[PDB]
Amino acid sequence: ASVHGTTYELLRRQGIDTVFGNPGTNELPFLKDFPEDFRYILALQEACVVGIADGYAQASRKPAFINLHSAAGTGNAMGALSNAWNSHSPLIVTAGQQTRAMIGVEALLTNVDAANLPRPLVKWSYEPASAAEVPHAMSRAIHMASMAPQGPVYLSVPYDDWDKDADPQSHHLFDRHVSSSVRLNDQDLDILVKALNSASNPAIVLGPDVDAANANADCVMLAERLKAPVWVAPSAPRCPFPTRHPCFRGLMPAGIAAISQLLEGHDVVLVIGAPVFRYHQYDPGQYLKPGTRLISVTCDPLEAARAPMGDAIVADIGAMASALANLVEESSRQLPTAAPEPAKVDQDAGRLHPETVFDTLNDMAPENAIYLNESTSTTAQMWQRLNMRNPGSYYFCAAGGLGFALPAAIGVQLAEPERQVIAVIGDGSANYSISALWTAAQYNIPTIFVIMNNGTYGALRWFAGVLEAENVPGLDVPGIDFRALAKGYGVQALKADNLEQLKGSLQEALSAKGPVLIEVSTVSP
Amino acid sequence: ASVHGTTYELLRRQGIDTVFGNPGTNELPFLKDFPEDFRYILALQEACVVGIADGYAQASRKPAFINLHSAAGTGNAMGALSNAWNSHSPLIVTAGQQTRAMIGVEALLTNVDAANLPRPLVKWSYEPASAAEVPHAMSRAIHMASMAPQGPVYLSVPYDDWDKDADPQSHHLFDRHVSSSVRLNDQDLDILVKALNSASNPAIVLGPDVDAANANADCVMLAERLKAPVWVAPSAPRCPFPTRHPCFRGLMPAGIAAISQLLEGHDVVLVIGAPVFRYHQYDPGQYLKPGTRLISVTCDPLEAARAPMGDAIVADIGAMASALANLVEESSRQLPTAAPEPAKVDQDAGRLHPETVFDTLNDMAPENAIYLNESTSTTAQMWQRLNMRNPGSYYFCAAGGLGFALPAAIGVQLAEPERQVIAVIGDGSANYSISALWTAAQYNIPTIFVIMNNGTYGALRWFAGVLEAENVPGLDVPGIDFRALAKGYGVQALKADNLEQLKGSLQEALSAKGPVLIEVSTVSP
Amino acid sequence: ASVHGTTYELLRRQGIDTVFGNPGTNELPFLKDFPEDFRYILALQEACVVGIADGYAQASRKPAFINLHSAAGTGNAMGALSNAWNSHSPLIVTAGQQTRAMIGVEALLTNVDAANLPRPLVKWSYEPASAAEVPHAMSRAIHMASMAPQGPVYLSVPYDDWDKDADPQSHHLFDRHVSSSVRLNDQDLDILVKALNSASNPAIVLGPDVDAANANADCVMLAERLKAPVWVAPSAPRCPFPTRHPCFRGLMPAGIAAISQLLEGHDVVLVIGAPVFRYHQYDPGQYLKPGTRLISVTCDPLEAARAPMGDAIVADIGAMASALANLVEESSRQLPTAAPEPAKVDQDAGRLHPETVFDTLNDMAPENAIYLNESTSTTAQMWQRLNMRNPGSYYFCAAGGLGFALPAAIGVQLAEPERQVIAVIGDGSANYSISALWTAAQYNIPTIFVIMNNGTYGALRWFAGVLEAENVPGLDVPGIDFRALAKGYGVQALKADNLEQLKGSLQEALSAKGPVLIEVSTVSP
Ligand SMILES: Cc1ncc(C[n+]2csc(CCOP(=O)(O)OP(=O)(O)O)c2C)c(N)n1
Ligand SMILES: Cc1ncc(C[n+]2csc(CCOP(=O)(O)OP(=O)(O)O)c2C)c(N)n1
Ligand SMILES: Cc1ncc(C[n+]2csc(CCOP(=O)(O)OP(=O)(O)O)c2C)c(N)n1
Ligand SMILES: [Ca+2]
Ligand SMILES: [Ca+2]
Ligand SMILES: [Ca+2]
Ligand SMILES: [Ca+2]
Ligand SMILES: [Ca+2]
Ligand SMILES: [Ca+2]
Ligand SMILES: [Cl-]
Ligand SMILES: [Cl-]
Ligand SMILES: [Cl-]
Ligand SMILES: [Mg+2]
Ligand SMILES: [Mg+2]
């Protein structure tokens, strides 16, 4: 067998059937004779390729396979990899290298010092020392991406390797099964359970790895048993809990002092599937107030090591959430009372308040909608105004890197064909990966894109206020016609200048058979 | 509090009380006002410092703390770090950096691009961005070294940081407890147990992480229950099983074909705490023969990813060995029969056969002796001839890097003051870290060093035979007087030119109150 | 032709005829059939191998070729590479890698992520992607080490590559000639010359790259023409000027304030072949005083970029020194007056003052002696007391990394068989690379080693005073018998407890036919 044949067999035997890519010369010998049971999803720039693959992996809860062109293609994707690292996305990033005989001279298309290029944003990065090693190296890539803590990996392959003879012993790779589905030993788990049972006022904080693990329902059971309020850890990349459940308390402010104040009076704070903590603004103070102790369950040693406070347990989130939910006592305390509905913001017949947009989405969208957020100044109101009952209902660029939501929404929609995806994206953010729209059109992936157009980088105006910064250039983005951009890439386009038009546009978008972009005129901050 | 005071408090609160070091200017502000509850162990070169710390960590089963001088000191230790990486040794390597104000100009003693220096031989490598961050960075170093899979880490600290004010919020670091003591979830563990119970001819292969976990006794119980032969995985850095137990089958040959042949007819091979596999010689063939399947339990994702065959489970070795030993059925198969005693090699009144040396050590040493091996051509015979009943009884440079055993034997002896340490070291290997002898003398650490003097790099002569290599230079090391070297560093020295003298020298060494070096004249290969 | 044959032909055609090494399994296929026109110089540990090669390269003013064993051997040499980086030593460091078929599994002896291991201490680091690329990669290594600014490079080669067929087109590599012998363009050189001619009180500062370029005599002519005082830049790795020439003003103090004070009143300061500046102690103040401007000529862009003051010209030191010496006007100012002889320090009949040792060396050594310095507390007095008339007469560890002088003195002596090498090494420093002594004995390289034995790390005691550091551990090194260590490695040993014995020992050492170690009892600091 050839390295080509053996590698595709390994991929299919490990559950991979889709290649997200933008092709190039070094990759042609990999992509030729493309297997009929695989699909290839083309995107027009590599940030888009990786964003789409990332949304697909996160929603599908399995690895996604990517093929990029050498150094330039890999480089175009590195902002996307920054998000993927923070979301623990299992991405297998492959890139083609020059033919081995031309690497030394650094011919055009040579990826120099290739394994170092995507560092430090990958778990593992490698170029094999021979063609026959390629299937083994691919096996390593698959498992490194897939083992807890999941994350992106990188494999560079010289283009002449694919036609070479494979090692017959590579067949042992095909059906390898690697598990990291582990939980704390019985003795120490009993100690933890006792501590939870004995807490007088426990609180629970959940991060993105809960949703990645589909541990949401177990966390609901855990919170109900403990009669404990539940927050989402700050800078949330996913939604780990039903947002109208009586225990839900919303998104934590991303500040040191704000969080310790919030947790004051809680004797035991159990954090599951989150870093401790992904702060954002500089809000100095106490990490925790006296009387509060913290226990973190995380899938990631790097998270456990860097937490500035608390104990930690490094284990699988799914396994730990299930064990805890089933072992803790039913507390006789009263179940927390549900948060009140948010207020309706006054809205005239002109430009839309973001609050109005979210209220209307919540009114009109199906109960199993999936939202993405890259509308950076409106995140708090989005979290308060969307009822998200189900797992996998929310995605936000995990490293804050813009250019995620537009392509990721296409990948999520591909992963979840029966759940309507609605990406709410600011006018500034929409540009970073604008060309991703084309992929939705070409493959008829019916994502809805809601562009919040206020003409400015609103979040930067806000932070400029906080940091007390005057005379900052480059904050405004006037003169972009998003309907024309959508037309450019073949996506149906609508425009909503007021509430009447917003409702009409959403009605038409929800009924449409393909992707739709709605440009919404929102109020200037 | 100062960064100095806070950092030493963090260290003591995390169980660290010993600094292995070779000092320099950048480190003086760290070492000044050295706490009276700490000890400092000086060695004369950094390979020695790290080797001693490594032996101490491996034997004590806890992290060891190291302080080296900038880039040059760190660099002198990098061969030692290669071994530490392969043995999963929890080493906290700190090095001093120039004062922050002189880093930019690259004053003498500036460690340039410091975090990159020890890569790729460390789990984590870092230089903090401010003085107040130092205690937090130290906390990260402690936990990164200590979490499974354990390994060396590196922290560089500008010398002016120590006197600066610490963050009062650093107190939250002091008592953090981080656990990776995890095992496979119940459902999947039950599946594994069933597979073991159902095997018709199981075999067990154990690696160094079994001994690191003190999982030895549980593995004995597991092997007895399953009535299974037990091998030690190739290139063994530690001994994970009693070598005269009836199930014991010895050290596996470090070859692909040799191992698959050995395992032929075994339907399920359970590997615990080893890479799959640390082959050495190139011995191409089948990874496994038809009819054999392999299941690996490893603490290290990198091991699970790169195994060319078998299933894998990434979990704590102690927790997994205990669970398996206690859950499996008692097989009604007959317990394996003990291996026969090795033959006595004919020995005249002249130079010693290595076999004679090992037989005599086995005859005379206490039953709780601890051996180290850096006699590279005699490893197979050492493994056959020493009865090692207890855990922690054997160490061999895990990456094959010479210069380990001499200093490590001093660290092991420091860790285990009641167990006589006997390091068996070739004349070639003895030189790499010869200056370590001084530390044994100065602190009166009563390690016994047995130098196997055959005048040559014997293992290289052997491999030259295998690789069919003629006219190779640099294979002979004549003209070294090891008694004089020992005298040079203050260690009592004896010489054994024949068996009578070997017995006499061992009797005197075993009775001595300090370290002793015995130069043994061994037969040329 | 084989890769082996082609690579050795490339080496000999590029002037390389000596391999400094410590062998291992991965290197056997390189070292087999070792060519009869090459020599192999064995050392017992890799810091020693590289130190010897480094001294040889620096003294010979040509590249030296090194062969080390995989990661562990490379790692043992990394402290040595820290010095080599700072001295711009042209070192070609090769290391053997596992056979390509066993790299993926990480068999014992695999150098993982090999090219990253010696970073950041090398100019170029590489592992070829195929056997046929090896000669080209070696060509790159040769030229990268040899081009200005010279420095160490690293090449890792899988052991199975050597027997493979070479590319016939590799013959084009054999006679390539690469020049960096460049100087500033005529127009701008005329401007510089004018500025020098017009200076009212110029000063000259010279660094190690002057001696590396053998630009010493041209700098003498330049200083005489300009009637300018000449200093050696701080932390000096080499001696660039005759130390009794009337213009010579000695070694600059390694402090910011000290240097600006020294240069006060000098209107133009011309620095040649030095970083600006290799400060050591933290001595904050003005980089230059008002009225002083600085012009640096350096072979190294990294030096030009990081200088905190002055203009810079990046060019070949030999070419620039020659051009300047021949173009500047003869100033009518009076030639500077020679520094007075240093005072004789009172000396009783007991332990030796370092000053006495240097005065006696100066009295007795040949006028073409070559000195090395690793006696860290006595550097200032050494510089004042040794008349060094000739180029290539002084070496000091360029990064301050101890373990340089002992092996480097052997390499220097090998390079300069007619010039008596005398290495003055502290008792502390002597241990780092003590095993290097064996190489001097084996090859009968008649280096003289003068061990300054004061029982302590004296320089650290001094800096502890400056940094105001009390209760520092690990500063004393009692109980080392250097005569026994020398005997251990086959080197004739003498001991000097007083001046009478020092003179007698030096007389015997200077007359000896082999290497000699003299242990000198020096006064405690
Ligand atoms: C790739 C990238 N570039 C720049 C930024 C910085 N950034 C953060 S928020 C923001 C503004 C985004 O504006 P928009 O999408 O219109 O949303 P708004 O803030 O107006 O709600 C920018 C530019 C970033 N996070 N990522
Ligand atoms: C730091 C380092 N340098 C070189 C080697 C290569 N090497 C492997 S075995 C060996 C010979 C050791 O000789 P000795 O200790 O006398 O034992 P013998 O082989 O004679 O039994 C050498 C040099 C190595 N493994 N590590
Ligand atoms: C590899 C390395 N380790 C540690 C140091 C720090 N250091 C600088 S000077 C010094 C003392 C050397 O003592 P010795 O050679 O006896 O000379 P003395 O200072 O007594 O004159 C030390 C340990 C260093 N520069 N390099
Ligand atoms: Ca509503
Ligand atoms: Ca906006
Ligand atoms: Ca016996
Ligand atoms: Ca030997
Ligand atoms: Ca004199
Ligand atoms: Ca000294
Ligand atoms: Cl358990
Ligand atoms: Cl479970
Ligand atoms: Cl010109
Ligand atoms: Mg990079
Ligand atoms: Mg490195």
PDB file of N, CA and C in Angstrom, chain B residues 136-168:
ATOM      1  N   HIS B 136       4.066  33.178  42.246  1.00  0.00           N
ATOM      2  CA  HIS B 136       3.090  32.487  41.405  1.00  0.00           C
ATOM      3  C   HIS B 136       3.778  31.601  40.365  1.00  0.00           C
ATOM      4  N   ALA B 137       4.851  32.109  39.761  1.00  0.00           N
ATOM      5  CA  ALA B 137       5.591  31.330  38.780  1.00  0.00           C
ATOM      6  C   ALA B 137       6.228  30.104  39.442  1.00  0.00           C
ATOM      7  N   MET B 138       6.714  30.266  40.669  1.00  0.00           N
ATOM      8  CA  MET B 138       7.269  29.139  41.416  1.00  0.00           C
ATOM      9  C   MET B 138       6.191  28.103  41.726  1.00  0.00           C
ATOM     10  N   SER B 139       5.000  28.575  42.086  1.00  0.00           N
ATOM     11  CA  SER B 139       3.861  27.693  42.322  1.00  0.00           C
ATOM     12  C   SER B 139       3.569  26.857  41.071  1.00  0.00           C
ATOM     13  N   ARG B 140       3.526  27.520  39.914  1.00  0.00           N
ATOM     14  CA  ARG B 140       3.334  26.827  38.648  1.00  0.00           C
ATOM     15  C   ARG B 140       4.412  25.779  38.410  1.00  0.00           C
ATOM     16  N   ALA B 141       5.665  26.136  38.698  1.00  0.00           N
ATOM     17  CA  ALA B 141       6.779  25.206  38.521  1.00  0.00           C
ATOM     18  C   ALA B 141       6.595  23.971  39.406  1.00  0.00           C
ATOM     19  N   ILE B 142       6.263  24.193  40.677  1.00  0.00           N
ATOM     20  CA  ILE B 142       6.043  23.076  41.595  1.00  0.00           C
ATOM     21  C   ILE B 142       4.976  22.116  41.076  1.00  0.00           C
ATOM     22  N   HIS B 143       3.839  22.660  40.664  1.00  0.00           N
ATOM     23  CA  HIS B 143       2.746  21.795  40.244  1.00  0.00           C
ATOM     24  C   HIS B 143       2.987  21.169  38.878  1.00  0.00           C
ATOM     25  N   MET B 144       3.589  21.919  37.954  1.00  0.00           N
ATOM     26  CA  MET B 144       3.910  21.330  36.652  1.00  0.00           C
ATOM     27  C   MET B 144       4.888  20.158  36.801  1.00  0.00           C
ATOM     28  N   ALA B 145       5.844  20.264  37.720  1.00  0.00           N
ATOM     29  CA  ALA B 145       6.786  19.159  37.905  1.00  0.00           C
ATOM     30  C   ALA B 145       6.077  17.952  38.521  1.00  0.00           C
ATOM     31  N   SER B 146       5.093  18.226  39.376  1.00  0.00           N
ATOM     32  CA  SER B 146       4.513  17.210  40.250  1.00  0.00           C
ATOM     33  C   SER B 146       3.311  16.478  39.667  1.00  0.00           C
ATOM     34  N   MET B 147       2.584  17.130  38.763  1.00  0.00           N
ATOM     35  CA  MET B 147       1.422  16.492  38.140  1.00  0.00           C
ATOM     36  C   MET B 147       1.849  15.413  37.157  1.00  0.00           C
ATOM     37  N   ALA B 148       1.067  14.342  37.072  1.00  0.00           N
ATOM     38  CA  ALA B 148       1.302  13.303  36.069  1.00  0.00           C
ATOM     39  C   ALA B 148       1.099  13.877  34.672  1.00  0.00           C
ATOM     40  N   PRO B 149       1.976  13.518  33.727  1.00  0.00           N
ATOM     41  CA  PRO B 149       3.202  12.740  33.909  1.00  0.00           C
ATOM     42  C   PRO B 149       4.284  13.658  34.470  1.00  0.00           C
ATOM     43  N   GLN B 150       4.910  13.249  35.567  1.00  0.00           N
ATOM     44  CA  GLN B 150       5.894  14.102  36.216  1.00  0.00           C
ATOM     45  C   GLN B 150       7.074  14.371  35.300  1.00  0.00           C
ATOM     46  N   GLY B 151       7.786  15.458  35.555  1.00  0.00           N
ATOM     47  CA  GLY B 151       8.921  15.789  34.720  1.00  0.00           C
ATOM     48  C   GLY B 151       9.595  17.063  35.159  1.00  0.00           C
ATOM     49  N   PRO B 152      10.749  17.359  34.557  1.00  0.00           N
ATOM     50  CA  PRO B 152      11.499  18.563  34.907  1.00  0.00           C
ATOM     51  C   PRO B 152      10.858  19.828  34.336  1.00  0.00           C
ATOM     52  N   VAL B 153      11.007  20.920  35.082  1.00  0.00           N
ATOM     53  CA  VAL B 153      10.509  22.229  34.683  1.00  0.00           C
ATOM     54  C   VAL B 153      11.604  23.255  34.940  1.00  0.00           C
ATOM     55  N   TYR B 154      11.458  24.447  34.368  1.00  0.00           N
ATOM     56  CA  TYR B 154      12.517  25.450  34.424  1.00  0.00           C
ATOM     57  C   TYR B 154      11.949  26.828  34.684  1.00  0.00           C
ATOM     58  N   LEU B 155      12.555  27.534  35.633  1.00  0.00           N
ATOM     59  CA  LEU B 155      12.147  28.883  35.985  1.00  0.00           C
ATOM     60  C   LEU B 155      13.380  29.765  36.111  1.00  0.00           C
ATOM     61  N   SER B 156      13.408  30.848  35.339  1.00  0.00           N
ATOM     62  CA  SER B 156      14.509  31.809  35.362  1.00  0.00           C
ATOM     63  C   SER B 156      14.058  33.054  36.118  1.00  0.00           C
ATOM     64  N   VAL B 157      14.864  33.524  37.071  1.00  0.00           N
ATOM     65  CA  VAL B 157      14.478  34.675  37.896  1.00  0.00           C
ATOM     66  C   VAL B 157      15.560  35.758  37.950  1.00  0.00           C
ATOM     67  N   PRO B 158      15.254  36.949  37.420  1.00  0.00           N
ATOM     68  CA  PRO B 158      16.177  38.087  37.537  1.00  0.00           C
ATOM     69  C   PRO B 158      16.594  38.344  38.979  1.00  0.00           C
ATOM     70  N   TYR B 159      17.880  38.593  39.188  1.00  0.00           N
ATOM     71  CA  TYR B 159      18.363  38.615  40.556  1.00  0.00           C
ATOM     72  C   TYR B 159      17.829  39.732  41.437  1.00  0.00           C
ATOM     73  N   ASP B 160      17.369  40.820  40.821  1.00  0.00           N
ATOM     74  CA  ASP B 160      16.801  41.921  41.593  1.00  0.00           C
ATOM     75  C   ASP B 160      15.361  41.676  42.072  1.00  0.00           C
ATOM     76  N   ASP B 161      14.733  40.593  41.620  1.00  0.00           N
ATOM     77  CA  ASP B 161      13.339  40.337  41.997  1.00  0.00           C
ATOM     78  C   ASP B 161      13.181  39.980  43.475  1.00  0.00           C
ATOM     79  N   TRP B 162      14.185  39.317  44.039  1.00  0.00           N
ATOM     80  CA  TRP B 162      14.049  38.703  45.365  1.00  0.00           C
ATOM     81  C   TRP B 162      13.776  39.710  46.488  1.00  0.00           C
ATOM     82  N   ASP B 163      14.381  40.889  46.400  1.00  0.00           N
ATOM     83  CA  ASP B 163      14.220  41.903  47.440  1.00  0.00           C
ATOM     84  C   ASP B 163      12.937  42.719  47.298  1.00  0.00           C
ATOM     85  N   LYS B 164      12.245  42.585  46.170  1.00  0.00           N
ATOM     86  CA  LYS B 164      11.038  43.380  45.940  1.00  0.00           C
ATOM     87  C   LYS B 164       9.881  42.913  46.806  1.00  0.00           C
ATOM     88  N   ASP B 165       8.906  43.798  47.003  1.00  0.00           N
ATOM     89  CA  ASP B 165       7.711  43.452  47.759  1.00  0.00           C
ATOM     90  C   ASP B 165       6.910  42.373  47.040  1.00  0.00           C
ATOM     91  N   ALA B 166       6.474  41.372  47.791  1.00  0.00           N
ATOM     92  CA  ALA B 166       5.570  40.377  47.247  1.00  0.00           C
ATOM     93  C   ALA B 166       4.131  40.893  47.262  1.00  0.00           C
ATOM     94  N   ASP B 167       3.317  40.327  46.389  1.00  0.00           N
ATOM     95  CA  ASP B 167       1.877  40.550  46.407  1.00  0.00           C
ATOM     96  C   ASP B 167       1.310  39.872  47.645  1.00  0.00           C
ATOM     97  N   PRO B 168       0.577  40.613  48.493  1.00  0.00           N
ATOM     98  CA  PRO B 168      -0.028  39.960  49.663  1.00  0.00           C
ATOM     99  C   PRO B 168      -0.964  38.815  49.274  1.00  0.00           C
TER     100      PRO B 168
END
